[PDB]
Amino acid sequence: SLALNPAVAPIKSIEFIPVNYQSQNTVVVKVTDENGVYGLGEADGSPDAILAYANIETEHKWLTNITEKAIGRLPIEINAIWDAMYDATQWQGMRGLGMFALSGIDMALYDLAGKQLGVPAYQLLGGTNKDKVHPYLTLYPAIPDASLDVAIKGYAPLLEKAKAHNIRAVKVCVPIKADWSTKEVAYYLRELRGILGHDTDMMVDYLYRFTDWYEVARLLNSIEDLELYFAEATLQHDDLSGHAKLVENTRSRICGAEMSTTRFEAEEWITKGKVHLLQSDYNRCGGLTELRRITEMATANNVQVMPHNWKTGITSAAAIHYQFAVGNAPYFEYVHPEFCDGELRKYLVTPEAELVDGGFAKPTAPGLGIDLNQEFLASL
Numbered sequence: 001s002l003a004l005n006p007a008v009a010p011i012k013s014i015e016f017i018p019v020n021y022q023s024q025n026t027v028v029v030k031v032t033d034e035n036g037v038y039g040l041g042e043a044d045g046s047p048d049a050i051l052a053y054a055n056i057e058t059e060h061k062w063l064t065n066i067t068e069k070a071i072g073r074l075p076i077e078i079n080a081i082w083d084a085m086y087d088a089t090q091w092q093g094m095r096g097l098g099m100f101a102l103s104g105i106d107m108a109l110y111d112l113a114g115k116q117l118g119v120p121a122y123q124l125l126g127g128t129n130k131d132k133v134h135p136y137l138t139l140y141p142a143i144p145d146a147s148l149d150v151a152i153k154g155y156a157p158l159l160e161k162a163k164a165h166n167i168r169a170v171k172v173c174v175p176i177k178a179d180w181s182t183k184e185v186a187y188y189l190r191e192l193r194g195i196l197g198h199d200t201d202m203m204v205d206y207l208y209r210f211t212d213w214y215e216v217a218r219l220l221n222s223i224e225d226l227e228l229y230f231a232e233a234t235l236q237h238d239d240l241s242g243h244a245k246l247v248e249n250t251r252s253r254i255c256g257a258e259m260s261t262t263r264f265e266a267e268e269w270i271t272k273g274k275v276h277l278l279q280s281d282y283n284r285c286g287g288l289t290e291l292r293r294i295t296e297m298a299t300a301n302n303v304q305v306m307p308h309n310w311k312t313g314i315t316s317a318a319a320i321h322y323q324f325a326v327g328n329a330p331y332f333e334y335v336h337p338e339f340c341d342g343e344l345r346k347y348l349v350t351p352e353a354e355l356v357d358g359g360f361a362k363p364t365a366p367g368l369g370i371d372l373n374q375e376f377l378a379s380l
Contacts, residue, residue, distance in 0.1 A: 007116045008076050009033040014067040014105060016054040018047035019312075019377070024344040026312050027051065028372070029104035031112050033075060039112025040349065040370060042314040043104030044283040045097050053093075053101055064088035066101050075113040078124075082106055082289045099261035099286055106287025107318050107368075114367030121318070121368050125292060125325035132359040133323040135334030136169030136203060136229075137162060138310070142341065145177030148184060152191050158339065159196045166358040167339075169201035169229060169331050176207050182219045193226045201331070205232040213245040220250040229331075230255050230277055240273040247274040258308045261285045266294045270301050277329070281308040282315050288322060295326050304329035313349035317368040320353055320360050347376045 010033060017028040027050045032038040043050050058064045069084040085102055092098055110121040122128055139162070141154030155172060162170050172192050174185055189204060196202055210216045216234045230253035235242040237259050246254045256275040257266055261284055269275050280286075280294055295305045306329050309319045316334060323332040336355060337346050349370040353360050363369050 005117070007035070007037075007118075008074050008113075009035045009037070009116065010072050010074055011070055011112075014054075014070055014108075016043070016051050016101070016104070018051050019344065019348065020047060021344045024342055026314075026344060026348070027104060028314065028348075029108045031070070031075070031105065031108040033112060033116065037112065037115055039075065039108040039110070039115060039367060040314055040372065041104040041107030041109070041111065041287070041318075042283050042311055043100040044281065044311065045100040049097060050101055050104075053097060060091070062088065062091040066093065066098070066105065070105060070109075075109050075116060078106065078109045078113060078289055081109060082286070086286075095261050095265070100284050103281075103283045103285060103287040103290075106289050107282060107314070110288050110318070110321070111367035111370070118366050120321065120363045120366060121288070122321040122325040122363060125288065125321065128324040128362065130324055130362075132361055133320065133327065134168045134331055134359045135319070135323070135336075135355075136171055136201065136306070136331040137167050137334060137336050137339050138171045138173075138205070139339060140173055143175065145175035147178075148180060148188060151175055151178070151188065152195075155192055156195055159192065162339065163197065163200060165338075165355070167200065168358045169203065170196070171203035171205055171232070171333070173205040173207055174209060176209065178209075182215060186219055186223050189223055189226060189228070193228070198227065201229045202226070203229045203232065206234050208233045208236060210234055211236055211239075213239075213242040213249075217246055217249045220246065220252040224251055229253060232279070233258060240268060243269075244272065244274040247276070253277055253304075255279055255306075259284070263290055263293045263297060267297060270298065270303050275303065277304040277306060279306060279308040279333075282318050282322070283311055284308075288318060288326070291322060292326050295328055299328045306332050309333040310335055312345050313352060313370060314368070316345075317349070317353070317363075317370045321363060321368060323360075324362060347373055349373060 027043045029041040139158045143154040232255040253276040255277045256269045258279040
């Protein structure tokens, strides 16, 4: 029989690396094979809690150290390793924090498997027929929570810059500690849309400031003319039935699942929440593997997926590969260096994908196409 690829070597180690910048932070997951080749991923959650979770001692069938079931396995069997890790950690990792850890490892396998096979991550996910992808950029000025005038002035230059770079879509937020009434919020969004223009799609993150679906429906119904792309974090994250109400009583796109984990929670958001779009996060919900299952399910149910993305360059890389091979929507969330502040997001990994005419070209490097910036890490 023909010879097997010697490069697909077993996993030798998995290291969780807490990264704190002096608050911005992350947990880099480095999976190294027996030949010294490694893959990089990252997990959400308090770095110290994640590190502790990653170092627990195995007790029984369902309470196993997360890395244990991955060590020794061939990186190419990402789907099987996912199941192995999940099955062995059900006692404390089926949802919540534990899944963030599993997510980082999953992401790192795509980087490792690709590097071993010398193929970009998106090809391991199925390839693509898109010649380019377009992200929407999440914007937020340096404002303190501020007042209507201050918030607007702060956004203005960011919005003008986005247009100058032909960014196809942007997301603005309603400051959390802002005491604006719902009518003021409507005014706010009308002013921002006025500045931005209608040529560029505009999304809105309400940051969970509401609890009554009726009040939200009134607000969303009154700004229908703004033709906003979607309404994010309108109601509390556990209030799935409330989101269904918004869907049933407004003509806005209703998002959900930003903080969720697994395809199981995603399925409930689809059928019970009736949401138009899911925002399950790369480094929270189960990685690219779970995002693929989630998206194929979503497509069958006429639901778009734009994974939440607000970490470092590691997740931004996965996001581009995701949009090329898995994405089922016109845009996906991306945080760009020239459109945000965050040393960690800017310097942790290299290189940074070049945004051309508001879009990204197909990745050309093996795996996720990234590497750690050692000088930066060593500098603490």
